[PDB]
Structures are given as structure tokens and as C-alpha cells.
Design a protein around this nucleic acid. Structure first.
Ligand SMILES: [Mg+2]
Lengths: 144, 187, 123, 258
RNA sequence: CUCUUAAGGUAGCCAAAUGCCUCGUCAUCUAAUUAGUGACGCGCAUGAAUGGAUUAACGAGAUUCCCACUGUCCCUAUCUA
RNA sequence: UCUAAGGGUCGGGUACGAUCAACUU
RNA sequence: AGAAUUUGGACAAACUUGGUCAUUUAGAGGAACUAAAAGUCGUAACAAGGUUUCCGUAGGUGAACCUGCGGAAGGAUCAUU
RNA sequence: ACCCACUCGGCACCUUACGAGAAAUCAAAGUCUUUGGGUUCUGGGGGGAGUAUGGUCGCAAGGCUGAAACUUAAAGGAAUUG
RNA sequence: GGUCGGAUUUCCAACGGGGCCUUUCCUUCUGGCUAACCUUGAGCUUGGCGAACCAGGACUUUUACUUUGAAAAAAUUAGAGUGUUCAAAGCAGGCGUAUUGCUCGAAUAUAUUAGCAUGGAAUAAUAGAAUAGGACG
RNA sequence: UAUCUGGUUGAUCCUGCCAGUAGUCAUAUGCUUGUCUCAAAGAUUAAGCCAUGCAUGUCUAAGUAUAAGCAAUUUAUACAGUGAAACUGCGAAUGGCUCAUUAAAUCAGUUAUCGUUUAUUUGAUAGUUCCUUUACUACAUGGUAUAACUGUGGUAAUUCUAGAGCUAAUACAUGCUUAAAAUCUCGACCCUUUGGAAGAGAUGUAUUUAUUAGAUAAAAAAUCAAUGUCUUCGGACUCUUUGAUGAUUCAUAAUAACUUUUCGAAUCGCAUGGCCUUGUGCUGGCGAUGGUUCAUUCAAAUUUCUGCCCUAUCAACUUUCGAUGGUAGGAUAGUGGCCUACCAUGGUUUCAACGGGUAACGGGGAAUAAGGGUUCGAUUCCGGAGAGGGAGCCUGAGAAACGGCUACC
């Protein structure tokens, strides 16, 4: 993540409809808005105390987690704020009464609240189409 | 016309999807407005299920809001000074959402005197009563009064001219103003 | 575009077309019961096989199975009702091996002979 | 394609209408109304296949606009008006009333009620929201919007309507031990005295049900209709009371009387 | 089978810059071809360091066809030093 | 008529500011 | 209010010339396979087939084939304290 | 270095068949219709044919991969008597 | 066989279930019912420990497999009942004083695999406390 | 209903194929053909071409009728009987046919829309619109054109139309009539300081933008800034208001404004009743049509997971000009490289990518079957796509529509 140098983009990075009044002075200088995705997933401390914007984050963005919940191992982390996981399952062929290995690559979106490496086991939650191929958002990483 | 579907351009594996299902109407696109300044000429567009959509062209003015003071005034737009997406929109003075513009900035001055009364830049007893109540609240931030001297406050359009037919926005304040001043002042 | 009418065929020809054992056996049934066809005989072998098929599969089920009880007694009762299954045989095992011509006995053509009035099956 | 379908072929209509496959290609398509298409009486079925008060679709019509039949106190001179769960059909002639209640097998049954009972009906609320200008309202299973309900009326609760106005006379909360009627699913048309419910936060709530004979079964929350408390219900249950006796027991009963 | 030599031209190749007859015969190229190319081969008089058969790249080398191009030509006219 | 990228030299207790100048795309 | 006409844009039919792929299809000549026919020449294999046979490889001869080197027994030897 | 006894590993050999196989034969070619220890490769009547074409490797000779049209009622294995 | 081929009690038996103890937590905090209550008022009373019913909380090693359940349109397949005169069919139909009318049905089974909930936890994997930020506190 | 037989030899046991055998709701064809019920039927080759005739129009009591149509109300001298034509409103996007395209495409089962549109039903839902809002106004109701029709013509023709002359609206088209109360703004004047005031404006809904609320596991104290409802200015202090979801910037409310400004009934049939200070005075039902928003229903679009035939004589593919992603914006009814600008080099693949073939629409299903399986599915149901090949578009809630239009071949 490396704090993503939050103001790298040409446009000002802000949370929509989150206005901090410069007239008054209050602690926590930058007012922040964060939500909980529900279903038992818990907001990481990075999301609450972070400085990124990432409007596609399930905890600080405008997206919501609903639908299928999937799990898989990270196989490609070379993009920006998006990784590819692989789901390994077994397919049953009823003629021979035995199974066979199969896999499916799923591109998922990872918030700056999470640091994922190749081999990390991550569970995801389905959201609205984030891009051409991304429909799932990283919601919890359970690997060390 | 313009299609918005995905049976065109290639799948995630690079494969070329074959022709299927001649273009349907419910996946249509339309020409961009490319809104300009002056001579307000807004053309209505009929959309799905009626729902008239105003394709604003050559818009003259708009409702701009002062976030700190919580007021909104109607001001003339002078021009476009910055646009994150493209510079050609700045050169041609195109008005789109999230475009930094300079506005008339006079109607905010008469409101400031009518509300606080002290000054900007540089009689009845009931007037001072309101002024006394609204005291020690005219020190908003130094970067804004300097703009009032030139009568052109920077602002960011928050409406979509080609979709709603209007052009509205807010006065840049605090970090937003600071961020866009190093962009403009850089040379 | 209308509801199709279900229809099924009610006979099945034997596998071996020419053998002395079956050909001489069928002709015994034809004369003894006054039948115009071997298809008249194949029809019962089709129904008997279907009845035998149902009893064969129900017997593999464990005893006191609710499906075996319900369909077993219904099959026994229906066979007992037409007289093809004797009253003393209600054990779902005599259904399997009744006879080829036990059903052929309840035919109205040969049933008239039993209650006189024809003095020949052809009559 | 290109718009809504105005036709309904046979062998595609719901099976609980018991429309014979032969003698006709199409089936009465229930027009838009208070109930889903897949769950609907519509009157032409009621007046020609359920009550036998008519023989063609013509005399079903000729009954309609001479105003002999009214649904829930309103005339409804429509051939295919969708009537769903527990609607009151009053026929002015013969001074007899009706209620639409599922039989044991899940089909709509001809239930006859007294005149006094025809003065009310129940509704399973589907959502509680805030209307314009902050006016709360409830939406029952038949789309009846009742503004200003009792604040205690939460979702999946049954309310009692007066059949003359939209006002709510009484309501029953949702809890274990309440009498429930099953609307949809394999157990459709049974009365089940909820024993407990399990949440599964994330959707598709499940509630466990045990009838009067301790024949427990599990049905989804979307198919459960609270109808009162233990013992007396708030309506008149049809004959059989939805017990779902075993198939091996029906033939025992069918041979008992003949 | 026969006369015969020191040995009697093997592998290849061909009307080839080497084939008299000869404008050889067949096919293709054309409206029409002693031209070109591909085959055939009792080859007047092809043939293996007299080197045989190929061969990418190269050539102010010889030849054929096609596209473009045009006063070469149909058919000449005009201007300048 | 514009836009963008491609540099040198100076300043940090034991991430930037100033000045300067090339034609290349 | 407002027709003809008109500037730029996106959508883009269609046509012409190229290129590529696929499927049929003509062709002098060449070289195979199969069948039939009492054809011609020899007798290569099956017996120690009259030089044991076969395998790989190379060269040669009208043709079956022959020969060199290494191998095999499917050999004609299960064997010489 | 020999002799005796035992044991591990090996090249083998002799007898017999509870066993297998169509048989010749086999201590594996046995524990396979009383059919399942793990795993890789290969075959689907005989010719055309390991041929044609396309690839790929080789200086070449050639190696690897590899058809179709067509044709046929038999080819083939092991034993018995002549 | 105490009723005339139909069921019950105390039963010698078999078969599968639930709970408790033998070193054997098979998570629990705010609170309600305080519950099954040491609770007993004189032989039916005034007062024990929350999941046995709940609302919210902290973590919760993850899979495969199998039982059960909902779901998997109708028609079609199997199958129950029944006059198409039998049958393929169809879902009808049956019973009365037929002068007033009554009434049983139109079930059920099957439905690969993928998805959801529940019990099991053998079998086959997965991780845990080892240059200890290991656990209870 | 778990079955075999003939053929290699002089004869024998095998391997092995050839042939026989039975079924097909699989077709074709030959011969023959008395009865009853039931019934497929130009799919296969040519999604090749088509003469002709039909296949979509529609009205009630309740939108508009002076037919110079028909009879007759006689209750009527404006109308109210029937009723061609025509305007208006709905429909023609259903149904029907075919299987050419199409191989993660369609489709099946299973999810989501907290990521959107929704004619029509069904249930609710506009005291706030006389604009310098005390003459500007018709509010017992305000204007315009036009169809039909009459008459004059064009060409041979088409569901071709011109010029002239009227008249209608639920056509177009402007346009008010109904309280109050409360609250926020300015604020005359007294002028006190504790500050009060007369007066005026704003406050429906719809659009757009900015901002605020949309809280809630537990209990007691310290004094400051000043009292904060009422004071015995000690302070008793409580009333202080808050819904839903697993989850939101949700529903909803409030403030400041913007809008060339949507809606807030200038409509129609019948019955005709009560009130009196008896005036064409005031109230008064059963309905029909319309209308903003929400919800419901009929849907639509997009979408999660898993699943498809034969091919390596297809091993790498996509990324110039979109490939995978980020940011911002446009476009859309909405999410999304759907598109644009800048930026990063990403994304799929021996677990069979990509390419090729299909005599491939996908499923429910059909044939034969001991068990396993093999083959088939143009075709009575569901879902797709197409109207000779392409592209484009008007109308509408809904079409890339073809018994709609435009262009090219
Ligand atoms: Mg209908």
C-alpha cells in the first residue's frame, strides 16, 4: 500500500458529502466516514485511522457487500488496488464415479486497509460491477 | 447508433466474441453536450419512460453554494481554469462536472455586508444587533478574501450539465482550495 | 400448439423369431383360448412383465417401507379384484410367478365358455 | 420480447388451478392486481372450474357486469382479476360469502363463511417505511397500503382489516407458539404452531414448525402466515385444518366410508 | 541370341550458350508466338575436378512475361536558347 | 496558436526551494 | 411558429483495389496402390527350400534380390567336470 | 584358503501344480466373473501404410508425429494327424 | 387374544436413540422467563444457578464426505382411484325418495450435478506451543 | 425383459472381424389395405424465389356528431333515439412461424439490484397555483387551428393529394377561485440593556446543488461561558425526539438557494334530493375519465456460482486503433473501458487458453437399455435470435419493429 501518496491523482481526493468546516477547530482534523460491511466482517483499524479514499472500499466507499461470499488464494497482486484469486474445486464426472481438479481465476478488488501477498488466503464479498471483470471486494484476510 | 453493450469488445481472455443480437435500443448512447458559456440554450431530450433529460448547451449562470456559510447564490461564470480529466476542456471553456471555474463573486459580497458588515478584501440599531450576535465569525480563511479583491472566486461545478441541464457547484475552501492553488500557480 | 395426447404401445415381439419351443407354445394358447394373433399373446406378456417388473423392484425394498406397503397392496388388490390373483396368495411373491395364461383366463371370450352359453371358445 | 406477454398457454399456468390439458390451448392470464400471477384464483377459474356456476367464458362475463360478484366489497367486473390468499368474495345472490384458503393439498378450496366473518380479513405486512411528510405506513401481502399503523406492528406481522375502510382493527405479533398458515412451498396449506425460528443473517430466514400431530417440518419465512395463537385462529379454517395425513392413511379413510 | 572393345557413358541432365533434321512433339503463355516456360528423350555431336546436378545473396551480363508509365507509335503540333 | 515529456548548478541538526538553458520527440 | 437548405461530429450501409484463410476444381508429364487376365523372365521364401532365416544400416544388380558391419532364435544346437 | 550351519542381497537352475493360460508354457505369465494395491505407455479384422501431405529435428542419410480415398472375408496364434 | 380376523397394559428378548459418572468445557457477557427453583407455607407455599425461550456482544482452523430438509414450472417417466363398453386415453366421477339435492377426487413417487440450512464426525487432507510477542489471570 | 448363431482348418482350441438377430413416437420407398378412437405432416436439399385472397383494429350510459343519413322523441327551440365519416384515446412490441447465426455465447439450476426503468392494474396520496399575489383576471369558466363535410382540379396509376370555405374537444393551448395555525427572515419605534415591538415576506410538490439530523451497552461528580424553560435567579430539571436493515451517504425531515418550470380537474352519464332571508341562491349521491408521488402487480435490463460436442497436422493469446487496472469526466434508465483524457503493465493458458470444425438454437425431454451407458432433441412447454443481407431511426411505458419508416446491395 505504502499509504498510496493519497493526493497522487490529478483530482482532489475526498469522501463525497463529507465536509469539514474550516471555521471551527476540532480534534481529528480530517472528519472521516466509515461503515461496517456486516455479516460478521469487522472494520480493520487501518480503515478507521487511514488516509486513503478508494471510493470502492467496502468500509469507507460507496459500495455495499451483498450476494455470494467466496474464498481463495491470492495468485496475482501486480495491479493497483486489484488482485486475482484462484478458486480450486473438484468436478464430478458421473460416468467414472470419480472427481477431477478444476480452478477459476477471479479478479477481486483490495482496499488499502488490507495488505495481501501472493499465497494469502482471503475471503471476498460480492459487490456491484467495479470494472469490466471485477465483481468481488476483499473483505477479510486470514493469513500471516 | 452508439452502443453501450459488451457483446462487442473482447472477453477477459482476449477472445473475440462473435456477432449476436443486433444492437438493442435499451443499450444506446448519445452525443456529449459539450456545454459552453453564454447564450443559455438548453435542449430537452426524451429518454426511456419519458423522463425528460435536459442536454444543457451554452449555459450562462448557475447556483453556487458557500459551504462554510451554508448559503447559495446565483452568479455568472467567467471561465474554466482547471479540469482534471482533460486540458482541452479548459482551453475550449467546456463546463462539465468537477471543473474548476471562476464565478461572478459579487453577490457573495453584498450578502457578507448584509450578514456581518465588516469588510471584504481591502445604520439602524437592529442591524448592529444582528451584527453583534454574528461576531467573531468573519475570519473564515485568508486564502478566500484575496480572491474577493479580484472579484473572482474559484469554485468546483458539482452538477452534470448534460444530464440535469443545470450547472451548480460550491466555493473551494480549505484543503480543496490549497490543492488546486498549487496546480494553477505552478508554471 | 396444443396439449399432446399421451399414447403407448401394448406389446413387444420376442427376441428369437423362429424357435420350435415358443412357436408351439403360443399356438397352444391360441387354440385353447380362441385368439386371432400372436399379438393377442404378446399383449399379456407385455402387461405381465410390467406387473412383474413392479413387484421385482418393490421386493428389493426393505419390509415395512411405506412405498412398498402402499403400492404392494394396491397391486395385489387390483390383481385379486380381476380374479387373476387368488385370494390366498397375497404375499407379493406369488405376483411374480402367476402364469402367462392366468390373465388369459379372465378374458371375456374364454369367460363366456366357463359360464356355458357357447359350447366353444370360437362361438 | 419487445414488451409484456399478454397470453398464457396451458401447461404453463399454475398447477393448482387444475385446468385440464385438453380442450383448449390457452389459459386465463391473470391481469395485474394485488397478487402474483403464479398465485391467483382468477375468477373465471373460480366461476367455471371451482363453483360450476357457469359453463363458458361468456356466461362468466354475463355474470360479471350485471354485478353479482364482488371481491372484498368491490365489484371487480373483470374476467381475470387476480384473487390470492384469503380474499373475501361476496355473491349478492343466494346471500353467501367466500374466503380463499388453501386446502391440505395446496389447492385453492371453496370455503364458505358467515356474513359476519366476511367483514374482515388479515394481511401479512411486507415492509414498514416512512411516507412523504414523515407518515408511516404498512404494506400487506395484497398490496393494501395502510397509513398510520400501530407502532408495534413490525415486519412479518398479521393485521386485521375492516373490509369497509383501510383502518386496522387488530394485529398479531410474530413469535414462537403462534398459529401459522403455510403459503407456498412443499408444505403449502398447513397450520403449524411455530416452535422456533433460525436467522441465518444474510437472507432467507428459516422457521421450524410443528403441527397438531407433532409432524415437524421446516419452511422459509417468506411462506409463513401468522393467523393467531394456540387454539382458536383469527379466521375459519377449512375442513381438514391442514394436517397432511400420510398417503397410506388416506386409502384407510377412503375405504372407511363409501 | 549374335559380332565386338582397353572399357563400351554409371549417377545425373537436356532441342540447354551444346539437337543437323528442326519452326522436334505435348502443355501453358496470346486473337494470333520460328520467342519464353514446363515436360519428353536412340542425345547429328549431354555427362561427372575437360568437373556432373543444384544453389540463397550478388550482376551497367543474355532472354521472356506482367503492372505502372509515357510522343516509341496512331500523327503530328507548338515554344525557348 | 497552444499542450506535454526529456536537464545543469546551488541550500538540509550531528520530501522540497532558488537560479540557469539546450533543441528532440 | 417555422419548411427547403447548411457546418462539424458520432453511427455506418455499400462499392473498388489489395492481402489472408478455407473449399471445390482443370492440367502436359511423373510416380504409386488395388483388382482382373492360364501374359513374359527368373525362383527370392516355406524342408539345413538346397548360400539357415530375420532385424538395423550402407552400397550395388533386369526383377525377385546380393554383399559388408553389428544384432536376434521366431535355428538346424537347451549338452563335453 | 577350505568344511559345516544360519542369514541378507544377486545371476540363475530342478520338481510339482492348490493356481493360470487357447495352447506352447508360467513361482510368475499365480493371489483376474468369488472381476478394485499404486502408476505410466500402447492396441481395436487384414491390406493401402508407417504411404501421401503439413510440421519439427538433421550437413545429409533420415528421425519423430501421421491420414484419407480405395480394397477385402478372412489374415493371424498354438497345438493334432497326415 | 381379557373384543369377535382387530389393540393394549408389569413383561422375560432383539433393534436402533437421549442424558449422567468415571482426570473427559462438548465457548461465554450485559438482562429478562428466573427455569428445570436449596425453593414446603400445615400436605400444592412468600425467596435457588439465563438459553430450556429470547435481543445485542468476543472470537470463532479450514475442507472433502454422508443423513435429513426446503428448492429444482407444467407436460413427459413411474404410480394411487375411477366406465373411455375393454384398451391407448381423459381426469373424471359416484350416490339419493331422481319430485328438493348430497359427496369423495384431481395424491404421491422421480428429478444428475451446482447453490442454502441442519446432524455426524469414521475415512482423506489442513493449521496449531520450539533462535516461545505460547495459554489461562 | 442379464440368451446368442453361420464363416478361416484335413480336423481342434483361440484372437478377431464379417454376416445374421431385435427395437426406434428415424425417415424414405415397394406391395397390400374392411371397421372404431387418436394423430404427426415442406425441419433435413434452398433463413431459395413468390402470383393471388385473407392474417389488426377498436366504443360505452358516461371525449367530440347540424351526415345537406335513418325513423321517431313529442320529456324538450340547443343537445340528449340510432347512427356512416372523421378527430381524440388505446392497440398494433401480444399471438404465429422458422432455426440461419451463435461453443462461457445461448441455456439450466441458483443469487443480486444498497446498481436501474416500469404503460396497465391494485391501495393510498395535492386546503399553501389571483404574482408589486387592494383591478392584473373569466372563475357561474378563458383563446386558436383543424379533421369530417361543400365546392373547384392534377396525372394512367398507390391506403397520392392541392387550392378555397366553415365548425368541435379529455386536440393544442393559457389560466384562478379554499382555510387556518405555527415557525424562520428582515425589521419600523420605544431605546433600554432582561429587550420588546408595529409591519412585511417566505414556508405544497417536482428539478438541481451544498449543508445538518437521521443518536441510542453503564453509574456518579468538579468548577469554569452565561441562569437555559420557572424561580424561594438555591437550582428541583426531569419533559428533552428519533424508524429499518447483516450492512449504507437508507426511508424521512430541516436550512440556503436554482428551474427556459412538472403536477395541484376550464372533462363526461344518470338520479335528481334537502335548506331557507324562493335566488336559476346554497348544499346534495351513484359513477366514468385524468392526474404528482409512493407501494403492489405484469415485466425489462444488467448480474454471482457451477455446468457444453470434436479437434495440438491449433501452443501460446490479448495489448498499434481497448487489451487488464486506477483516477476524473461524458453517455446511459442505471453499474461497468460502455466511451474519452492522463497514468500503470497488466489480463488468459497443458486443470486444454487461442484458433479450426459442427451435416450445433439451448433445455424440459426421446430411442434402446440387468447395472453402468450410447445416440438423439428443426418440432405441441420455457428461454434466445431472425423477417432477402446489413446499417439507421420516428412513435411509445415498451421496438433497433420490419403484415413501421429511411438508405445501400
Ligand atoms: Mg388477462
Amino acid at each position: 500500500s505504502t499509504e498510496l501518496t493519497v493526493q497522487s491523482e490529478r483530482a482532489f481526493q475526498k469522501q463525497p458529502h463529507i465536509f469539514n468546516n474550516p471555521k471551527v477547530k476540532t480534534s481529528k482534523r480530517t472528519k472521516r466516514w466509515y461503515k461496517n460491511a456486516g455479516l460478521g466482517f469487522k472494520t480493520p483499524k487501518t480503515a478507521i485511522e487511514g488516509s486513503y479514499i478508494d471510493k470502492k472500499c467496502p468500509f469507507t466507499g460507496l459500495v455495499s457487500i451483498r450476494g455470494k461470499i467466496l474464498t481463495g488464494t491470492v495468485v496475482s497482486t501486480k495491479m493497483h488496488r486489484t488482485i486475482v484469486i484462484r478458486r480450486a474445486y473438484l468436478h464430478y464426472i458421473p460416468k467414472y464415479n470419480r472427481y477431477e481438479k478444476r480452478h477459476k481465476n477471479v479478479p477481486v478488488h483490495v482496499s488499502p486497509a488490507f495488505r495481501v501477498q501472493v499465497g494469502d488466503i482471503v475471503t471476498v464479498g460480492q459487490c456491484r460491477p467495479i470494472s469490466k471483470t471485477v465483481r468481488f471486494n476483499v473483505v477479510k484476510v486470514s493469513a500471516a | 447508433g452508439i452502443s453501450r453493450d459488451s457483446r462487442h469488445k473482447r472477453s477477459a481472455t482476449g477472445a473475440k466474441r462473435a456477432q449476436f443480437r443486433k444492437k438493442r435500443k435499451f443499450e444506446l448512447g448519445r452525443q456529449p453536450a459539450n456545454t459552453k458559456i453564454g447564450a443559455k440554450r438548453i435542449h430537452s431530450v426524451r429518454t426511456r419512460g419519458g423522463n425528460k433529460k435536459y442536454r444543457a448547451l451554452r449555459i450562462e449562470t448557475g447556483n453556487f453554494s458557500w459551504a462554510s456559510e451554508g448559503i447559495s447564490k446565483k452568479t455568472r461564470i467567467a471561465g474554466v481554469v482547471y479540469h482534471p480529466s482533460n486540458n482541452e476542456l479548459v482551453r475550449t471553456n467546456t463546463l462539465t462536472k468537477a471543473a474548476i471555474v471562476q464565478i461572478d463573486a459579487t453577490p457573495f459580497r453584498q450578502w457578507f455586508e448584509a450578514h456581518y458588515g465588516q469588510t471584504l478584501g481591502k445604520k439602524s440599531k437592529n442591524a448592529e444587533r444582528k451584527w453583534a450576535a454574528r461576531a467573531a465569525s468573519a475570519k473564515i480563511e485568508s486564502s478566500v478574501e484575496s480572491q474577493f479583491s479580484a472579484g473572482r472566486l474559484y469554485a468546483c461545478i458539482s452538477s452534470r450539465p448534460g444530464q440535469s441541464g443545470r450547472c451548480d457547484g460550491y466555493i473551494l475552501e480549505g484543503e480543496e482550495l490549497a490543492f488546486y492553488l498549487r496546480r494553477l500557480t505552478a508554471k | 400448439p396444443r396439449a399432446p395426447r399421451t399414447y403407448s404401445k401394448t406389446y413387444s415381439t420376442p427376441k428369437r423369431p423362429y424357435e420350435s419351443s415358443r412357436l408351439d407354445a403360443e399356438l397352444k394358447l391360441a387354440g385353447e383360448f380362441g385368439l386371432k394373433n400372436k399379438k393377442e399373446i404378446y399383449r399379456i406378456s407385455f402387461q405381465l412383465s410390467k406387473i412383474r417388473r413392479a413387484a421385482r423392484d418393490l421386493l428389493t425394498r426393505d419390509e415395512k417401507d411405506p412405498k412398498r406397503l402402499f403400492e404392494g397392496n394396491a397391486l395385489i388388490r387390483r390383481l385379486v379384484r380381476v380374479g387373476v390373483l387368488s385370494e390366498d396368495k397375497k404375499k407379493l411373491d406369488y405376483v411374480l410367478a402367476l402364469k402367462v395364461e392366468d390373465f388369459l383366463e379372465r378374458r371375456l371370450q374364454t369367460q363366456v365358455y366357463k359360464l356355458g352359453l357357447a359350447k366353444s371358445v370360437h362361438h | 420480447a419487445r414488451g409484456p406477454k399478454k397470453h398464457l398457454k396451458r401447461l404453463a399456468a399454475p398447477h393448482h388451478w387444475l385446468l385440464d390439458k385438453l380442450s383448449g390451448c390457452y389459459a386465463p392470464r391473470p391481469s395485474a392486481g394485488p397478487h402474483k400471477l403464479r398465485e391467483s384464483l382468477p375468477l373465471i377459474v373460480f366461476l367455471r372450474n371451482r363453483l360450476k356456476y357457469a359453463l363458458n367464458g361468456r356466461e362468466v362475463k354475463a355474470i360479471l357486469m350485471q354485478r353479482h360478484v364482488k371481491v372484498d366489497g368491490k365489484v371487480r367486473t373483470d374476467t381475470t382479476y387476480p384473487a390470492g390468499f384469503m380474499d373475501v368474495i361476496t355473491l349478492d345472490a343466494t346471500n353467501e360469502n367466500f374466503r380463499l384458503v388453501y386446502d391440505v393439498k395446496g389447492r385453492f378450496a371453496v370455503h364458505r363463511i358467515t356474513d359476519e366473518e366476511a367483514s374482515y380479513k388479515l394481511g401479512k405486512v411486507k415492509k414498514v417505511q416512512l411516507g412523504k411528510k414523515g407518515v408511516p405506513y404498512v404494506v400487506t401481502h395484497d398490496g393494501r397500503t395502510i397509513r398510520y399503523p400501530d407502532p408495534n406492528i413490525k415486519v412479518n406481522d398479521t393485521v386485521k382489516i375492516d373490509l369497509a375502510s383501510g383502518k386496522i382493527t387488530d394485529f398479531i405479533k410474530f413469535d414462537a407458539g403462534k398459529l401459522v398458515y403455510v403459503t407456498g412451498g412443499r408444505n403449502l396449506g398447513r397450520i403449524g404452531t411455530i416452535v422456533h425460528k433460525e436467522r441465518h443473517d444474510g437472507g432467507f430466514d428459516l422457521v421450524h414448525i410443528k403441527d397438531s400431530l407433532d409432524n415437524t417440518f421446516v419452511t422459509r419465512l417468506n411462506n409463513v402466515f401468522v393467523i393467531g395463537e394456540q387454539g382458536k385462529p383469527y379466521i375459519s379454517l377449512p375442513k381438514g385444518k391442514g394436517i397432511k395425513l400420510s398417503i397410506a392413511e388416506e386409502r384407510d379413510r377412503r375405504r372407511a366410508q363409501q
